A paper describes a structure:
Adenosine triphosphate (ATP) synthases are multi-subunit protein complexes that use an electrochemical proton motive force across a membrane to make the cell’s supply of ATP from adenosine diphosphate (ADP) and inorganic phosphate (Pi). Proton translocation across the membrane-embedded FO region of the complex occurs via two offset half-channels. The passage of protons causes rotation of a rotor subcomplex, inducing conformational change in the catalytic F1 region to produce ATP while a peripheral stalk subcomplex holds the F1 region stationary relative to the spinning rotor during catalysis. The F1 region consists of subunits α3β3γδε, while the FO region is usually formed by three subunits with the stoichiometry ab2c9-15.
We determined structures of intact ATP synthase from Bacillus [name] in three rotational states by cryo-EM. Three conformations corresponding to different rotational states of the enzyme were identified by ab-initio 3D classification and refined to high resolution. The 3D classes contain 45, 35, and 20% of particle images and the overall resolutions of the corresponding cryo-EM maps were 3.0, 3.0, and 3.2 Å, respectively. As expected, the most striking difference between the three rotational states of the Bacillus [name] structure is the angular position of the rotor (subunits γεc10). The structure of the ATP synthase, with three αβ pairs in the F1 region and 10 c-subunits in the FO region, results in symmetry mismatch between the 120° steps of the F1 motor and 36° steps of the FO motor. By comparing the positions of equivalent c-subunits in different rotational states, the observed rotational step sizes in the three rotational states of the ATP synthase appear to be almost exactly 3, 4 and 3 c-subunits. Bacillus [name] ATP synthase is found in a conformation that has been proposed to allow ATP synthesis while ATP hydrolysis is auto-inhibited. In this state, subunit ε maintains an up conformation and inserts into the αDPβDP interface, forcing βDP to adopt an open conformation (lower, dashed box). In contrast, all three non-catalytic sites in the cryo-EM map are occupied by Mg-ATP, while a Mg-ADP molecule and a weak density tentatively assigned to phosphate are found in the βTP site and by the p-loop of βE, respectively. The cryo-EM maps show that a clash between subunit ε and βTP blocks the central rotor turning in the direction of ATP hydrolysis while it is still free to turn in the direction of ATP synthesis, which could explain the ability of subunit ε to selectively inhibit ATP hydrolysis.
Residue numbers in the entry:
A (entry chain a): 6 to 131, 152 to 191, 198 to 234
B (entry chain H): 4 to 67
C (entry chain G): 58 to 228
D (entry chain c1), F (entry chain c2), G (entry chain c3), H (entry chain c4), I (entry chain c5), J (entry chain c0), ...: 2 to 72
E (entry chain b1): 7 to 56
Write the structure that this text describes.
């Protein structure tokens, strides 16, 4: 399970998982936003429910006039992190090489650069103790999502090997239901703490 | 020392009883002399005056 | 009056969007200037400072005040009548708990009492006593600290309606 | 040889801290909904928010314990 | 080929089967509650106009 | 050599964390049902949810203890 | 060698966790039965299932200490 | 060689757990009989079944520390 | 050679557990004294039997510590 | 060799301290928004600055843990 | 040999237990004086005999620490 | 050569103490702003000077850990 | 040699126990003179004798740490 | 040799005890000035003499840590 990199500069498998999660998020977004309907049904009501959910979170943290801009960053951020956490659970394939296609959030560099991208955005829209608190909250957000996905990934993998090598269906079943629970809770706390620091720096 | 049960209509039962065990809305209570100043809203139940050798039940509605 | 205690809605004065009125008249006539003085002072204090029928609500006690405010087309939201000559506590208790619970819904935001104060047999002074919020309060020249058995808040939630009912029954 | 019990004390102290923090949070949530049932959805919401926040920093100790077992 | 892949994918499928017997009744009722709520909200306005 | 000691202190600190957290949440739910007895099913269901969410990290400590024992 | 020290530290930490957790549960349920003594069977069944959880995770801790002593 | 230190940490941690548990139980029952004085026999019977209930696992930890001292 | 360390930590953990348990029971039995004076004999009898309960295991610990030092 | 165990106790004690601190803060803000639910933002911002403090000292501890690991 | 740190860890755990127990009981005597300052003699005499009870087992531990240091 | 273990236990115990102290202070101050809001600035300043004290002793602990690892 | 470790440990656990006990006694006397300020001198003087009582034995541990450092 | 981690366990346990006791004192003084604000200078002066009284013994633990490190 080594870091398989075709190029010396960057991990190849992480780029593959970023591309596949971007395409699956984009196609579920355009499948939920096919046509305009004033009476919501099907999946457009689901997309509007996620949209008003993100909006509600923004309304909890800040005034609606200040935080109205962030709604379309926040909904793609929660859906992106949501699908990025749930991709690691079904397949997690092992090839004759090092490793291929685990999940993007299990990579520490992916989650830490997504967290520092979040904080770069909330510095863009917006004394040593304040800046060390800033670097502290960046790295604890990135390490939060990275750890709480990567431990479950390793455990699921361990369970998979224990089952295949030699009766053990329900422990990994209970853990895998708990892991999609961890995925949706981590996506929600990630976008909510994103909006908290956005509200803290805007107003 | 002594208990005094009053009503807006008029006082009902004033005696010399050293033990009362009226039920408050949190739960049971027990009062002997030398007790701390304590305040309890009483539930709709009976107060037990059991210090004169035999118990004496007195009901409260509203209650305090 | 001790350890704060102003967190309850019946101590602190909320902003005023309405005003309740508890008017105490008689069921029967042949009293000379009893009902005339009470209903005149209530009509003056209502028409002086509101100028809108939606900004007040009136709770009458007595058929004379009820007929007064139905001749003058005013709301008589709580309207019990037919009291005995020496009234007990239960018949005023049910309208008193309805009055306090109608304050606690956020409707009245304050209310007043209007009644004739019996001094000695010939005057019968008209009083305007503010029922609640309980801002006007005074300690009994010496105080002992209390232990609150559930908490302070539940004791206030039980006690302050009973104090309002006792004020209403005394008036 | 020493990295094994290094990883073990790391995951053990993480489990201890997360257990105490989760116990404090969840116990206060259920006594709060015992005080009144009308706010149990918002108290369960902030319950899971709190459980994530106290189970977050021990699991970075867990994955760092795996790093310690790696070296 | 590895053995873990089809094993955990098969139990993910049977977990979705258990979650289908357990879970299609709540969230479809939540979506139907939202749909009926917004239809009654839409409906009142059209009636109010008429 | 050190793997069995590692395994044992890992499962022991997991047991300590789960015991303290479960003791807190169960104690507050029984004083909650002692305060208002008509809230017993809601209180004990949220209590079992709390048992799961305080014993999340000790249970993973147990299987990582088996990893530590295996090495 | 280290296996007996492992078994004993597992039993010791499980005993300490069970002691603190069950002490919290039993203490709050006897003060709850001191408040409202008509709720004796409900409080006793809930303290028994809570104690069953708080004991039963150190129970598997103790049998894991037995298989640590065997190794 | 390490079996005596094993039995020592086992008996010591079981003693600390039993001490905190019995302290919680007897402390809350002494404030409980301080509140309602006529509930003393029910509170004492539930207190003693709680004390035996919380020292159940420390005494079996002691009698397992004996065979830890042997092995 | 480590029997002296074994006996010493057994006595120390017994003293720490006995100190916490006696601190809890004496502390809120004097709270019970301070709330009402008239129940001083029954509060003190339940106090001293609680002292016996929280000290008994500790006493066993120090006797077994002398057995451990003899080993 | 011992730098691995040094980094491990550093991250473990930091995780334990951050877990207990975050558990206390979020516990009492649960009961704060349960007593007075209209004070949710003024409780929430002070909650998050407390979380920032009680994590930020174990965060610089776990930042130092890697230079403990290297040596 | 290591009997010196044996004696010292006995002194240290006895000091920790005596400190926590004495802190609890004298703190709640202050709380009881604050509730009712006219029973200061009976509160202080029950305080000092509780201090004797909490202090007794660490003093026994420290004289055994003297017998442990020599060996 | 044990200076890395020295500095790491120093940073870890300082982080644990600062975490528990900051958790207590921040938790009671959000309860203070929860029971009454109108002097949140009065509460916050004394909260921050308490945080300053309970971290300023582990800050000099961390600096002393730096000069421990230097030796 | 290892007597330095002995003395430091005694000093450290004496400081920890004295810190927790002094924190309890001073914190509860803050609450005590906060609720009834007209009583302040008598309860702060019995607070000071409680302070001397809770830190009597850690000073004895400091003296014994001088003895252990001498050995 | 081991004097550096002797110095460090002294500083670490002193910092942990100072953190817990100081957190208790500051938390009770802010809830005291929260429930009645007019006694802020009195409560802060007795809080500062209390925290000086607590951290008196960890500071002499730090200078004893200095003479342990010099050893």
């Amino acid at each position: 399970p080594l870091v398989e990199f075709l190029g010396l500069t960057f991990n190849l498998s992480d780029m593959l998982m970023i591309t596949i999660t971007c395409l699956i998020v984009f196609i579920i977004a355009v499948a939920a936003t096919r046509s305009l309907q004033l009476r919501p049904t099907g999946m457009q009501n689901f997309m509007e429910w996620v949209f008003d959910f993100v909006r509600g979170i923004i309304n909890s943290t800040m005034d609606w006039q200040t935080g109205g801009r962030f709604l379309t960053l926040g909904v793609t951020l929660i859906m992106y992190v949501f699908v990025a956490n749930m991709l690691g659970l079904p397949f997690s394939v092992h090839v004759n090489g090092e490793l291929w296609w685990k999940s993007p959030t299990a990579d520490a560099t992916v989650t830490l650069t997504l967290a520092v991208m979040v904080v770069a955005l909330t510095h863009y829209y917006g004394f040593p103790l304040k800046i060390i608190e800033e670097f502290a909250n960046t790295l604890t957000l990135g390490l939060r999502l990275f750890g709480n996905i990567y431990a479950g990934e390793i455990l699921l993998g361990l369970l998979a090997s224990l089952g295949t090598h030699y009766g053990a269906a329900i422990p990994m079943m209970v853990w895998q239901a708990f892991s999609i629970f961890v995925g949706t809770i981590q996506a929600f706390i990630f976008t909510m703490l994103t909006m908290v620091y956005m509200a803290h720096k805007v107003s | 020392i002594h208990v005094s049960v009053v009503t807006p209509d008029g006082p009902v039962y004033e005696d010399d009883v050293e033990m009362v065990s009226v039920k408050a809305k949190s739960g049971e209570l027990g009062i002997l002399p030398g007790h701390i100043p304590l305040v309890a809203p009483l539930e709709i139940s009976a107060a037990r005056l059991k210090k004169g050798g035999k118990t004496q039940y007195i009901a409260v509605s509203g209650g305090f | 009056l001790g350890a704060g205690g102003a967190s309850h809605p019946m101590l602190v004065s909320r902003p005023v969007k309405k005003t309740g009125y508890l008017v105490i008249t008689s069921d029967r006539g042949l009293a000379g200037a009893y009902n005339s003085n009470v209903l005149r002072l209530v009509y003056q204090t209502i028409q002086k400072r509101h100028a809108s029928p939606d900004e007040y609500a009136i709770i009458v006690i007595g058929r004379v005040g009820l007929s007064f405010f139905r001749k003058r087309n005013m709301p008589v939201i709580l309207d019990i009548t037919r009291l005995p000559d020496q009234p007990s506590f239960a018949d005023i208790k049910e309208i008193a708990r309805k009055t306090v619970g109608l304050f606690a819904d956020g409707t009245f935001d304050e209310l007043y009492m209007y009644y004739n104060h019996y001094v000695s047999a010939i005057q019968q002074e008209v009083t305007e006593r503010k029922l609640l919020p309980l801002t006007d309060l005074a300690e009994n020249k010496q105080r002992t600290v209390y232990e609150f058995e559930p908490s302070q808040e539940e004791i206030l939630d039980v006690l302050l309606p009973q104090y309002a009912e006792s004020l209403i029954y005394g008036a | 040889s020493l990295g094994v019990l290094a990883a073990a004390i790391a995951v053990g102290l993480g489990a201890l801290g997360a257990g105490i923090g989760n116990g404090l949070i969840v116990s206060r949530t259920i006594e709060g909904i015992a005080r009144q049932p009308e706010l149990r959805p918002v108290l369960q919401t902030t319950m899971f928010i709190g459980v994530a926040l106290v189970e977050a920093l021990p699991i970075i100790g867990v994955v760092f314990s795996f790093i310690y077992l790696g070296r | 080929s590895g053995g873990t892949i089809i094993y955990q994918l098969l139990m993910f499928i049977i977990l979705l089967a258990l979650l289908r017997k357990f879970a299609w009744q709540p969230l479809m009722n939540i979506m139907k509650q939202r749909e009926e709520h917004i239809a009654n909200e839409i409906d009142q306005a059209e009636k109010r106009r008429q």
